[PDB]
Amino acid sequence: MEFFGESWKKHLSGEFGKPYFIKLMGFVAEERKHYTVYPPPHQVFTWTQMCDIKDVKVVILGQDPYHGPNQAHGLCFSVQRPVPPPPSLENIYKELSTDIEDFVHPGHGDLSGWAKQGVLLLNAVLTVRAHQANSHKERGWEQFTDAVVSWLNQNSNGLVFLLWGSYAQKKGSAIDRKRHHVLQTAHPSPLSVYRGFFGCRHFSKTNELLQKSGKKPIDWKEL
């Protein structure tokens, strides 16, 4: 697989030969003949290029990639310059400013700095037709990302999973809470942020949990 991180390729290569995945790649290829699909080919697996698979420490599960021009770049919640941070990400920064004492709003929404430190920003569906939310759901991506979550669940220890919102909580329902830490709350979207996300303190809690398992904490201000 191209544009796919080496360490990830070594452990997930088995998925590449399965019927559902081969069908999925065919479907996405067909879609790109007739539509603009985001993210562009080289950014569909950005989440595998930022850090080694064994350096993953924290997992944040998302649902669908952004469907507007230049927004999605392979990481959930993240947008690259010059796109302004979406409402959900602004709410994430708000929580961070009250939770992590040294947090400074960077004025952009590119979360590459977190990905570099082992924060896996994984969407459940990895492509989308331009301007059409959820247009690529149930074509095989969910099985693939379930396989990625299953691999981490069984081959890693002491990961922190942040499950925000209904979709993420369902997808993360299979995580072994004896081996990993699971923090749950409402989605940071303006529509639900007041249902628990504000005040969840997931960022300091994550660092506290990482230390107790002997892992290096995330420097959340490092964006």
Catalytic residue numbers read: 64
Give Cα separations from 212 to 56, 148, 168 (angstroms). 16, 25, 25
Contact, 35 vs 129, CB < 8 A?
yes
207 annotated as a binding-site residue: no
166 annotated as a binding-site residue: yes
179 annotated as a binding-site residue: no
13 annotated as a binding-site residue: no
Contact, 110 vs 80, CB < 8 A?
yes
Give the CA-trace dihedral at 87, 104, 207, 159, to 10 degrees. 40
187 annotated as a binding-site residue: yes
88 annotated as a binding-site residue: yes
Contact, 77 vs 88, CB < 8 A?
yes
Burial degree of 78 (CB within 10 A; 0-12, 13-18, 19+)? buried
27 annotated as a binding-site residue: no
| Annotated binding residues for dsDNA | 67, 88, 166, 187, 189, 192, 195
| Annotated binding residues | 63, 67, 77, 88, 123, 166, 187, 189, 192, 195
| Annotated binding residues for uracil | 63, 77, 123, 187
